[PDB]
Ligand binder design. Structure first.
Ligand code: G83
Ligand code: G83
Lengths: 180, 180
């Protein structure tokens, strides 16, 4: 009920559709000129953001202390406009919930809102052959074109959707401390 | 973009969650006290509508001239409140579109909005062993609990989701002339 409304306001104000040479993704802007994509989107020095080319000034593929893949890329956009700062809405650690929304917004799947149910701390996953950490698992989404989707509960952004197999979907935890 | 917004306003104002002895469904109220469910929901003399028992005064399983199943049940509710009249938003015939939204709202899948893509006039289908007519086909939804979902484009209600197999989903066309 409310999760949906929180999710619409977030996507309206902070999401965009991105095309890289590797596909189409939902992208979430975080603050200033910093946004987040799944690592596998591999953004280059320019991306198409809502149909417009936008320069990327820097791109950081996140890894943990020991260098384990976190499957997220932080990108700094070469644009004058700043994002509305949503760092306050970010989870401080991996979050488990009984109900969450996955929000996806691309030209192929516009304005898609999926109630994904129980979200659990899956932890380590061999995702597309790559050892990955801080995975959140949920049942029931799981097609190409949905990566970058934003996983949310009321008033919190939990993760960014990165992978899946069968009826299972996986988000990279989107943690407050990643930003700065 | 707009299809989503039209879809939210419709669901907000005219949809409800229904439980019959046969499951949980999205239900759309049409006008007066008349609402629509998939035929297979088989509503009895009482249904649970948004958590409250509500009497059903009459239930008509629709069939065409020759008695072919249309897979829709019209129900008249024993309640004082009238539905907002949306007969004007109903398609007059089977509609094919390149993009449509499927909106599903139950306790298990709350506030679910799915862009389903190309919607074509499939026509006759052997659905769950029953010969059925006036089917609209689209790719990509297709789980238990989603029947009754409302298929829409901007400013039009096209159908009610009734069945599926694999990545294919099927709506019964929701035609203006069924109401009266
Ligand atoms: C989003 C990005 C995308 O579409 O890229 C291709 C254009 C996509 C979403 C998943 C596809 C299936 N379900 C989804 O939700 N992500 C990926 O494809 C992701 C890319 C990736 C991520 C990390 C490192 C490398 C690559 N890969 C996966 O999700 C893979 C999918 C896969 O290879 O399997 C099939 C394509 C389904 C055959 N999933 C995976 O490796 O899971 C292993 C596994 C097995 C059993 C249980 C859990 C997980
Ligand atoms: C919604 C109602 C429901 O959940 O009832 C059970 C509690 C549900 C939605 C579909 C399930 C799979 N995908 C869906 O979108 N509807 C049905 O289950 C529907 C009930 C029905 C409708 C009409 C007459 C009798 C019964 N049945 C179907 O969709 C059947 C599903 C089925 O039996 O197959 C599996 C369960 C998937 C194994 N679909 C069907 O008969 O399709 C035949 C077909 C084959 C190849 C191409 C197209 C269609």
């Amino acid at each position: 009920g409310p999760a949906f409304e929180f999710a619409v306001a977030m996507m309206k104000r902070n999401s965009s559709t991105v095309k890289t040479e590797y596909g189409e993704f939902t992208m979430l802007g975080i603050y200033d000129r910093w946004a987040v994509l799944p690592r596998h989107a591999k953004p280059g020095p320019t991306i198409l953001m809502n149909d417009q080319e936008v320069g990327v000034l820097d791109a950081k593929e996140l890894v943990d202390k020991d260098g384990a893949n976190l499957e997220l890329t932080l990108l700094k956009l070469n644009r004058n406009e700043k994002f509305r700062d949503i760092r306050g809405f970010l989870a401080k650690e991996e979050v488990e919930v009984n109900e969450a929304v996955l929000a996806i917004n691309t030209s192929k799947f516009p304005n898609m809102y999926i109630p994904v149910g129980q979200v659990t701390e899956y932890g380590f996953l061999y995702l597309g052959g790559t050892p990955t950490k801080r995975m959140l698992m949920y049942n029931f989404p799981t097609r190409a074109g949905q990566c970058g989707g934003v996983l949310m509960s009321t008033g919190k952004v939990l993760g960014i959707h990165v992978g899946g197999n069968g009826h299972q979907g996986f988000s990279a935890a989107l943690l407050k401390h990643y930003f700065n």
